């Protein structure tokens, strides 16, 4: 009748925004070569293949990437399994010995500063009473001068003695498919033109996310997932000059980076079973390791990002690019991994042009560090061992990280300077498309129906 009555309905699909943990998945291909040759192989399970991505209709879901969850817990998760891939390796506390150290036998010119220091030192042997005199090659960003005589020490040893990487474990990123626990769901926005926040008007619920590869970079986030057709900037907000404008483009820039200094691995036994690894002899011809990008694709992609960066600042706007302005070494460069080696390459020669509103290769030099201090903690270092051969790797530049300078009082030039800073923004471009929700069933709705007594 007119007196309608409540019915409780169970399992109404509605959702609410919440925060929860997530749960990993990987391919089957990572388990073929097995048992911690890469990380997360004893940690989390193989996926179901073909994620069951089912599109929805007539729903507008409000997305946001900057107050988002799940980009925090990947930043805790990578650090936690980084510690779990460094616990059973050997401590290198007996290495911090006073060094007797000289140049490598090289034709020295006065302008070029020598990148190799050949040091010999005392080291213990397998028996504790005999000791051996051994020699190594070290890079000059890892050796400092203690105070005729030139005696040296390792850079970390007035902070904390620190840990060798095991050469069993590799460093290349395997994809991680993030996936939802029981009672939550993951929503994906699938618009092309989408700049971060507000209503997305075409959503898809998914079981597990796509392939996300955790690749550390400071500037120039590489091997990343492209856009759909245009070039898009994204921002927290543009007029604030503290949060980084991050830009993502469609067609990649192929970047070839290499080390030509042919290295020999040498094992020194510290004591019982502590197989320390060092450089041996440098054969071939001693050069400086370097990165290469092609000129024409760089000129055209910089034209595309100044075209889509002019829309927020008026059409009569002079836009130029500088290199970074200061700080330590992990933010002036772009710093990146290649096959088990760390590179720190001075990117002044990329970001230097102005633009007006009307065969060919760029090289850039690159230094090599060995003690890293990843995520800037206090008592941690990861010593990379050195690898045989000429090291060569190609990659795909996709997205750049840009912070402005505070350009004031009316003049329409606005500089942009690349400098990444925080580690999360090489993940937040990779995960700008999902939010987690909690299903809350038991809706309540009226009908014309009364229960029999």
């Amino acid at each position: 009748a007119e007196n309608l009555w409540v019915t409780v309905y169970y399992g109404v699909p509605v959702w609410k925004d919440a925060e929860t943990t997530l749960f990993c998945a990987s391919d089957a291909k990572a388990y073929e070569t097995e048992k911690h040759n890469v990380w997360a192989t004893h940690a989390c399970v193989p996926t179901d293949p073909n994620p069951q991505e089912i599109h929805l209709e007539n729903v507008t879901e409000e997305f946001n990437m900057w107050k988002n969850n799940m980009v925090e817990q990947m930043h805790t998760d990578i650090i936690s399994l980084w510690d779990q891939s460094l616990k059973p390796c050997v401590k290198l506390t007996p290495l911090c010995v006073t060094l007797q150290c000289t140049n490598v036998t090289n034709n020295i010119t006065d302008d070029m500063r020598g990148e190799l220091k050949n040091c010999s030192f005392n080291m213990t042997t397998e028996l504790r009473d005999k000791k051996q005199k051994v020699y190594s090659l070290f890079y000059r960003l890892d050796v400092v001068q203690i105070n005729s005589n030139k005696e040296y020490r390792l850079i970390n040893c007035n902070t904390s003695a620190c840990t060798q990487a095991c050469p069993k474990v590799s460093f290349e990123p395997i994809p991680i498919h993030y996936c939802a626990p029981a009672g939550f769901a993951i929503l994906k926005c699938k618009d092309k033109k989408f700049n971060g926040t507000g209503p997305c008007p075409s959503v898809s619920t998914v079981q597990c996310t796509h392939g996300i590869k955790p690749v550390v970079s400071t500037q120039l986030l590489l091997n990343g997932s492209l856009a759909e057709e245009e070039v898009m900037i994204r921002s927290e907000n543009i007029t604030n000059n503290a949060k980084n404008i991050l830009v993502q483009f469609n067609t990649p820039v192929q970047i070839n980076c290499t080390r030509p200094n042919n290295n020999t691995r040498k094992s020194i036994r510290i004591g019982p079973g502590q197989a320390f690894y060092a450089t041996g002899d440098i054969i071939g011809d001693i050069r400086q390791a370097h990165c290469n990008v092609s000129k024409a694709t760089w000129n055209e992609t910089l034209g595309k990002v100044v075209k889509q960066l002019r829309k927020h600042f008026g059409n009569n706007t002079i836009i130029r690019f500088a290199n970074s302005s200061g700080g330590d070494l992990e933010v002036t460069t772009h710093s990146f991994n290649c096959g088990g080696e760390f590179f720190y390459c001075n990117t002044s020669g990329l970001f230097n042009s102005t633009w007006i509103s009307n065969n060919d290769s760029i090289t850039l030099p690159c230094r090599i560090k060995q003690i890293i201090n990843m995520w800037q903690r206090i008592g941690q270092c990861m010593y990379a061992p050195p690898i045989q051969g000429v090291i060569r790797c190609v990659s795909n530049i996709t997205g750049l990280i840009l912070t402005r300078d505070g350009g004031s009082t009316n003049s329409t030039t606005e500089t942009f300077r690349p400098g990444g800073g925080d580690m999360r923004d090489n993940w937040r471009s990779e995960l700008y498309k999902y939010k987690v929700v909690k299903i809350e069933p038991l809706g309540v709705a009226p009908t014309r129906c009364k229960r029999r007594v």
């Binding site: 007029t239 000059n241 503290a242 505070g406 350009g407 009316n410």
Partner: protein, 102 residues
């Protein structure tokens, strides 16, 4: 760039009362912030993100407003507050609103 303007500038009032400062950004929607500064000392904060005061400041200070228009209300003007008052978003500041004993 984004220029500010405050409404009273110099003001010379009486204790015990209410007073609404008004500031006027040139593009809207902003995160508004309020500052009380004594002469020759540290400026400390009153109000962050247009509405909400800090810890350890009295609750007589309330910020309000939206869009391009922001009020700073003080009720029961006590003897402490004869100072200058600034309003800001990020990299700019106001001229400086002064409230004086008369």
């Amino acid at each position: 760039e984004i220029v500010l303007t405050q409404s009273p500038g110099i003001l010379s009032l009486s204790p015990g009362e209410t007073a609404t400062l008004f500031c006027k950004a040139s593009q809207g929607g902003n995160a508004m912030t309020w500052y009380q500064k004594r002469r020759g000392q540290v400026p400390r904060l009153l109000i962050y993100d247009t509405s909400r005061r800090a810890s350890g400041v009295p609750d007589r200070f309330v910020g309000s407003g939206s869009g391009t228009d922001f009020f700073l209300t003080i009720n029961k003007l006590d003897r402490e507050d004869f100072a200058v008052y600034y309003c800001q978003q990020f990299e700019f500041f106001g001229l400086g609103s002064e409230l004086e004993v008369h």
